[PDB]
């Protein structure tokens, strides 16, 4: 259970999964990388992202 935008781990009992229009969009660690995604932003580009660097 890993975040698929920011990266790392996802806590055992938190972290959402939302669904977009047609099925798409995955989890979140939380509201952090979330709104970051909402604004069009790519995690492989900004600051500490596991995906980053």
């Amino acid at each position: 259970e890993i975040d698929s935008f920011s990266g790392a781990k996802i806590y055992p009992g938190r972290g959402t999964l939302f669904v977009r229009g047609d099925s798409k969009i995955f989890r979140f660690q939380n509201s952090k990388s979330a709104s970051l995604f909402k604004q069009r932003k790519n995690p492989r580009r900004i600051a500490w992202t596991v995906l980053f660097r």
Partner: protein, 131 residues
């Protein structure tokens, strides 16, 4: 029976949502949902899993006008879980259904929640996608 999943009520009455297909559906608007209670400043409530009565605001066919029912497929408001924490995702949702509970429209646009299937099969059935 049991949703087995906690749900917060995303949309109240007079709310406008999108049918994820009926025939000539469009955007139904919510009228009281199943047997439900009330209180001062009640704001009826509704949420995924709860059968709702509704009218077809948009349309095309002479579906528009009204009567109903339909079940809310998806909602924007959180959920619950059994495993993780859960989601809200899409826009809200709703599919018209017969008293049988079957859809009155062959295809359902959009996804559907897992424990909506449990409440009513056939609705989940012609899902197209679950989860």
């Amino acid at each position: 029976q049991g949703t087995k999943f906690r749900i917060s009520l995303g949309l109240p009455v007079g709310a406008i949502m999108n049918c994820a297909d009926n025939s000539g559906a469009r955007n139904l608007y919510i009228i009281a949902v199943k047997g439900s209670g009330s209180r001062l400043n009640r704001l009826p409530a509704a949420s995924l899993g709860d059968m709702v009565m509704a009218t077809v605001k948009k349309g095309k066919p002479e579906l528009r006008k009204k009567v109903m029912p339909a079940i809310v497929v998806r909602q924007a408001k959180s959920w619950r879980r059994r495993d993780g924490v859960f989601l809200y995702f899409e826009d809200n949702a709703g599919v018209i259904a017969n008293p049988k509970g079957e859809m009155k429209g062959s295809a359902i646009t959009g996804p559907v929640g897992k424990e909506c299937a449990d409440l009513w099969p056939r609705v989940a059935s012609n899902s197209g996608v679950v989860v």
